Amino acid sequence: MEIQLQQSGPELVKPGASVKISCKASGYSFTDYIMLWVKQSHGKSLEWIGNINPYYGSTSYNLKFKGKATLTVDKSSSTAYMQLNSLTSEDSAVYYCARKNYYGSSLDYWGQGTTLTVSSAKTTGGGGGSDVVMTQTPFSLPVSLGDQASISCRSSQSLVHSNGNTYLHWYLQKPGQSPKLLIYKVSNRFSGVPDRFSGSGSGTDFTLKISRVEAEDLGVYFCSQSTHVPYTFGGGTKLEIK
């Protein structure tokens, strides 16, 4: 009908338990896209958990989560599932569902999110390969609406891909809901988006720009790289009022 990922309600489980979060897709062809899951803990904000191809059912994980998260899909119903085992208070956080396209290797449509609280009490309240770190600065940009804003995401290493493209994306998350794609591949405004937003830079130095900051543009700005696996996100930049 129209693009929408419908994640399961909020969970509340005690340690040692397992959970199975659902992600209902509608508005597009389920087997034609990779479903990517993300963990946002407030206190790391964003981490790529894994990918799943609905079509062949093939998975791909971030070492950090492989062995604890199991991604399966069920096709008649157009849904993706992520299961978490042996839960601990560390697992407490918000998990997002995210569809990733091929042309831009970006997350263009996210789920609303599922809050999971791991708790024992009834009611709410060795060598290795280097992963690309994404340093974002500055991480809080206090402003007076109107003035120019320029954030910069630095990549431990070049994001240039063999095919000539550079998979660096900018997302904007408003307190409350899921992140939203602003720019894909360094400087391409996504379906929608304002035009006062422009991404530049190459190699290792990238920059987003808002030559005039408006209120609807206050939140946390996240840059993300998907040229390398694991997919990685910058720390985020808080753009708020003085």
- Give the span between the Cα atoms of 12 and 48, in whole angstroms: 22
> Do residue 224 and residue 188 come from a single domain?
yes
Residue 154 burial (CB count, 10 A) = 16
Q: Is the distance from CB of 157 to CB of 142 less than 8 angstroms?
A: no
Same domain, 55 and 89: yes
Distance CA 28, CA 74 (A): 15
Q: Are residues 75 and 195 in the same domain?
A: no
Q: How far apart are CA 2 and CA 26, in angstroms?
A: 7
Structural domain ending residue among the three candidates 113, 130, 147:
130
* Single-letter amino acid code for the residue at 60: S
- Nearest partner of 230 among 49, 38, 45, 81, judged by Cα: 49
Which residues, at least 6 apart from 142, have a Cβ–Cβ distance to it below 8 Å?
Answer: 240, 241, 242
- Residue 241 belongs to some domain of the structure: no
> Are 98 and 135 part of one and the same domain?
no
Task: Compute the C-alpha angle 170/166/63, nearest 5°.
Answer: 75
Q: How far apart are CA 146 and CA 212, in angstroms?
A: 5
Residue 117 covered by a domain? yes
Q: At 46, which CATH number? A: 2.60.40.10
The token pair that represents 111 in the structure block? 């789920």
Query: Do both 30 and 116 map to the same domain?
Result: yes
Domain contains 239? no
Rounded CA-CA distance 7/25 in Å is 9
Q: What is the 3-state secondary structure (H, E, C) of the chain?
A: CCCEEEECCCEEECCCCCEEEEEEEECCCHHHCEEEEEEECCCCCEEEEEEECCCCCCEEECCCCECCEEEEEECCCCEEEEEECCCCHHHCEEEEEEEECCCCCCEEEEECCEEEEECCCCCCCCCCCCCCCEEEECCEEEECCCCCEEEEEEECCCCECCCCCECEEEEEECCCCCCEEEEECCCEECCCCCCCEEEEEECCEEEEEECCCCHHHCEEEEEEECCCCCCEECCCEEEEEC
User: CA end-to-end span of the chain, whole Å?
Assistant: 42
Domain-ending residue, one of 80, 105, 130: 130
Q: For residue 16, give its domain range.
A: 1-130
Buried-exposed string 63-72: b where 16+ CB fall within 10 A, e elsewhere: eebeeebbbe
- CA-based torsion, 150, 199, 227, 181: positive or negative: positive
Tokens at 34, concatenated: 């990779």
CA torsion, points 135, 136, 140, 141, in degrees to nearest 10? 140
Instruction: Output the CA torsion sign for 64, 66, 70, 73.
Output: positive
Domain count, the chain: 2
Residues 6+ apart with CB under 8 A from 79: 22, 23, 24, 25, 73
Q: Which two tokens stand for residue 51?
A: 């990918």
Burial class (CB in 10 A: 0-12, 13-18, 19+), 30: buried
Same domain, 45 and 97: yes
Name the one residue in this structure whose structure tokens are 């990918």: 51
The CA distance from 95 to 116, in Å, is: 8
